[PDB]
């Protein structure tokens, strides 16, 4: 219903070259820069006064590592995305109160980061594969909301 075998292979191969902590810190930082309203959950993270401040903020980087690490572990279960992220869905809805729209935006920022990081290697077909992935992850994270 989503990824074809060639698409899964493409996602897996590219991801095998990703510095998860690095991409995570960068995607979260970019999310907070490009869509500043997402800063609302991180006032306790300190300085987010400018883009350089956000990107250089240690707590923003720390959080991006956590977020992308859980995203990365989920790429090993592209056949059970809803189940894989169920407990994080409940958590984000029941305790964190994070609007699922934020997952969709982070998803697209991740795609822009991957395109910036990999250049031409991030071909249109590879992008389409990753678009299904970020949409699936975002849908799975939003599934337990009530």
């Amino acid at each position: 219903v989503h990824l074809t075998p060639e698409e899964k292979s493409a996602v897996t191969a590219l991801w095998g070259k990703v510095n998860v902590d690095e991409v995570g810190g960068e995607a979260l930082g970019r999310l907070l820069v490009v869509y500043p309203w997402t800063q609302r959950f991180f006032e306790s993270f300190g300085d987010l006064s400018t883009p350089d401040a956000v990107m250089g903020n240690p707590k923003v980087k720390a959080h991006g590592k956590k977020v992308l690490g859980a995203f990365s572990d989920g790429l090993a279960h592209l056949d059970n995305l809803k189940g894989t992220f169920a407990t994080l869905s409940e958590l984000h809805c029941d305790k964190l109160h994070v609007d699922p729209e934020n997952f969709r935006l982070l998803g697209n920022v991740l795609v822009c980061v991957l395109a910036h990081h990999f250049g031409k290697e991030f071909t249109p077909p590879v992008q389409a594969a990753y678009q299904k992935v970020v949409a699936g992850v975002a849908n799975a994270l939003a599934h337990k909301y009530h």
């Binding site: 309203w37 609302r40 994070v98 609007d99």
Partner: protein
Amino acid sequence: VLSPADKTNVKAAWGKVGAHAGEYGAEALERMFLSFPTTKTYFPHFDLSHGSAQVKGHGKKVADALTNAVAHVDDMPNALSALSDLHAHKLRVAPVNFKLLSHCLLVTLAAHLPAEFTPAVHASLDKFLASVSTVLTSKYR
């Protein structure tokens, strides 16, 4: 932009709303929380039960702000300046949610205005709520 005909339709429709604006405001919020659960993520500090005084109070402010917007339809950005500041820098509601509430406000008006909610008025009201939304998210970045 809001045409002379749209502004006329809006004023007439909201004029019939009259003193019920606040009650309709709270109903629109209730409709929103039940129809689009994710919108509740912005009010974890609220009792969101049917009849809730917190929802009634918030509904009253939302309605009053729109009444003020209707009264300044030709000079809307300034009338809503303080609310734009507030939503852009404190509340930080993702833009998509304004579309959910606008839709629930339309549904609320439709359920209460059998005579005035004609296709033309529906169109004008939708444009009006979209412009209010645009204004309220105009300082986001």
